[PDB]
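Quick one, tokens below. Sequence please?
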């Protein structure tokens, strides 16, 4: 009880192994989420959105390390199912609460509910979002903020800072055109924590920029989350240094930088000290042009307003000269050093490789992303956990199910995700923080690659980097994780369009121990409701063909 005195995690600290030890708080944080169909004018232009409780971003789930969180999700829409995923939450022996349509549950139909219950067995910053088709990017997402230890001190916690791309047509409206094109999706603008201005065709300014206020001398924590559909950002604040203290849910040895490159699904916790002359400073979220197509890359900005700065007055500050805003990169392996030091014990690991390609299918054609040789093609109404309940020793996986088996308790898997294309992708794994062993450009060399096993970066989302066409294209990333968590775990590109097109596989982990978590009633109650919806509403039927809005299932 000498550690972290007068905190909810008294008896534990920054050195506690949070994979093995959790504070007991006895506390349950209970949330009620209505998923609603509405409109909003987040940058001053009205359009349809799907929201949690009428808010964008959705309300923050806030808890202390070791709490239990209970989220009652009710579907108040007409024409979508829903499922809510808690990104980066380990869900240890709790796979059926992971919120993945077609894996861990059927979708929740309109007028039905699902109660997610999970343990805060990590601390730091993340987010929840729909894991049903493109719905997260219609606005169904919000923060997860779990208080706990930190690797540097500060005075004020500003909470979540979401980074989003945005357009005035919806992602669902765009989807058919995306499917039928070899060009990446184009977005018109972006939002910082759900706000921006917009310049109209007649040069009027509508909307309002994100703004935050600093007291000179004070230190502020910002919890950055990239929730964009198809944009890799560099975040910066003119004239201010940023001290990075965590990557995803893993506290790291702090380091200071002038910008944070942040991929879709990733989080970084930063501390900013108000040590500049009192003034207004631009906060910038800049799409990286190699892998983002945005009409307004230089106008996704907010305002840092010091007390002492002019009111009603935009910044005139200059961007940090950190180089170009072209490549889509992570912090390097040597920059991200987990504070809790753990080695990747990959002796005796199972080795796998999943290639990434983009291929035409059918007569239109539709251009689909494939991972490990197949575009994922699975079933909302027949989720993987139903298949294994019906047949506990099932071995007859279809190619289109994209299965990677990890049957042996605690045995490591080393997975190489590779591509020949000049296109990078943020790779996210459910149910695990993976160990990031390598990340590179060009061809993967099985002889020459060095794997970092000595306290490598550890997180839940990392880029498969790729070279530009002039440098030959292609790239790879290599991850390691032990089979410490029975369940069916999605591994996929965190670009929504890509995952829905097929860029996803499923890790079937310790299949013989699904009894540790599985509830037939929790599965079938929702599946039965979903079937009743599908009878009366065409949106209840999954489009799985090649002349319409193909849905991979996730
Ligand atoms: C970004 O938007 C979120 C969601 O509205 C804001 O969340 C608040 O965060 C603070 C600090 O953790 C909490 O006190 C509030 O309860 C949250 N409100 C919610 C979730 O409705 C967040 O403050 C915004 N970020 C900034 C920097 O303004
Ligand atoms: C997910 C969902 O329910 N979306 C619906 C949409 O289908 C309908 O066109 C609109 C107008 O009624 O309301 C909203
Ligand atoms: C504004 C809008 O999108 N409205 C659509 C409507 O045209 C359609 O008939 C209905 C069912 O698909 O969904 C809603
Ligand atoms: C409109 C509709 O069909 N809804 C029915 C309603 O009678 C019931 O009260 C509710 C809660 O179970 O869900 C069901
Ligand atoms: C669930 C589903 O769509 N089943 C299809 C069937 O309709 C189709 O005739 C066949 C050949 O393409 O492949 C399978
Ligand atoms: C793109 C593709 O291969 N789609 C197939 C579809 O033809 C088939 O009907 C279905 C069977 O469940 O699986 C999927
Ligand atoms: O109210 C929920 C939480 O929101 C945030 C801060 O404002 C805290 O003071 C508060 O506990
Ligand atoms: O409206 C944008 C798109 O929406 C969806 C389908 O209705 C398509 O036919 C259409 O092109
Ligand atoms: O491209 C025009 C397109 O706009 C949007 C919808 O109103 C569609 O019905 C229409 O086809
Ligand atoms: O392909 C789905 C849908 O896309 C758009 C239009 O071309 C429609 O006529 C068509 O039905
Ligand atoms: O995050 O999926
Ligand atoms: Cu996830
Ligand atoms: Cu992708
Ligand atoms: Cu996911």
């Amino acid at each position: 009880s000498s550690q972290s005195p007068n905190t909810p995690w008294q008896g534990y600290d920054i050195n506690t192994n949070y994979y093995e030890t959790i504070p007991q708080t006895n506390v349950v944080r209970e949330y009620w989420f209505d998923i609603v169909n509405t409109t909003a004018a987040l940058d001053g232009v009205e359009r349809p959105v799907l929201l949690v409780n009428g808010q964008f971003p959705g309300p923050t789930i806030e808890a202390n390390w070791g709490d239990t969180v209970k989220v009652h999700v009710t579907n108040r829409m007409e024409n979508n199912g829903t499922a809510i995923h808690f990104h980066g939450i380990r869900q240890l022996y709790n796979n059926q609460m992971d919120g993945v349509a077609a894996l861990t549950q059927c979708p929740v139909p309109p007028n039905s509910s699902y109660t997610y219950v999970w343990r805060a067995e990590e601390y730091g910053s993340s987010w929840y979002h729909s894991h049903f088709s493109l719905q997260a990017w219609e606005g169904v997402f919000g923060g997860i903020l779990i208080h706990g230890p930190s690797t540097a001190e500060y005075d004020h916690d500003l909470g979540m800072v979401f980074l989003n791309d945005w357009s005035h047509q919806t992602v669902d409206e765009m989807y058919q055109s995306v499917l039928e094109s070899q060009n990446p999706p184009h977005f018109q603008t972006g939002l910082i924590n759900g706000s921006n201005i917009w310049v109209t065709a007649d040069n009027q300014t509508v909307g309002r920029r994100f703004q935050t206020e600093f007291v000179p001398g004070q230190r502020y924590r910002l919890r950055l989350v990239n929730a964009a559909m198809d944009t890799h950002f560099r975040f910066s604040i003119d004239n201010h240094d940023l001290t990075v203290i965590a990557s995803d849910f893993v506290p790291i040895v702090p380091f200071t930088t002038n910008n944070v490159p942040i991929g879709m699904g990733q989080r970084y916790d930063i501390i900013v000290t108000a040590n500049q002359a009192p003034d207004n400073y631009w906060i910038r979220a800049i799409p990286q042009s190699f892998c983002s197509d945005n009409a307004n890359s230089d106008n996704i900005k907010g305002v840092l307003h010091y007390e002492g700065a002019a009111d009603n007055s935009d910044p005139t500050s200059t961007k940090w000269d950190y180089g170009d805003d072209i490549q889509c990169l992570d912090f390097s392996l040597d920059e991200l050093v987990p504070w809790l030091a753990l080695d990747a014990d990959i002796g005796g690991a199972q080795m796998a490789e999943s290639d990434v390609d983009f291929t035409p299918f059918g007569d239109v054609p539709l251009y689909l992303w494939t991972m490990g040789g197949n575009a994922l093609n699975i079933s909302w109404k027949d989720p993987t956990l139903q298949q294994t309940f019906e047949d506990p020793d099932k071995m007859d996986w279809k190619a289109s199910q994209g299965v990677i088996e990890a049957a042996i308790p605690n045995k490591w898997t080393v997975l190489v995700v590779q591509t020949d294309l000049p296109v990078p992708h943020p790779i996210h794994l459910h149910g695990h923080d993976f160990y990031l062993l390598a990340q590179g450009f060009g061809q993967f060399n099985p002889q020459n690659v060095t794997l970092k096993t000595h306290n490598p970066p550890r997180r839940d989302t990392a880029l498969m980097t790729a070279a530009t066409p002039e440098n030959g294209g292609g790239g790879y990333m290599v991850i390691g994780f032990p089979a410490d968590n029975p369940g069916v775990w999605l591994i996929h590109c965190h670009i929504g369009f890509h995952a829905t097109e097929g860029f996803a596989q499923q890790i079937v982990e310790r299949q013989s121990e699904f009894n540790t978590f599985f509830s037939e009633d929790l599965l079938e109650n929702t599946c039965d409701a979903w079937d009743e919806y599908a009878k009366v509403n065409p949106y209840g039927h999954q489009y799985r063909a090649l002349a319409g809005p193909y849905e991979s299932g996730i």
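Residues 173, 176 surround beta-D-mannopyranose (ligand 8) (CB under 6 Å). Residues 166 and 189 are 5 Å apart (CA to CA).
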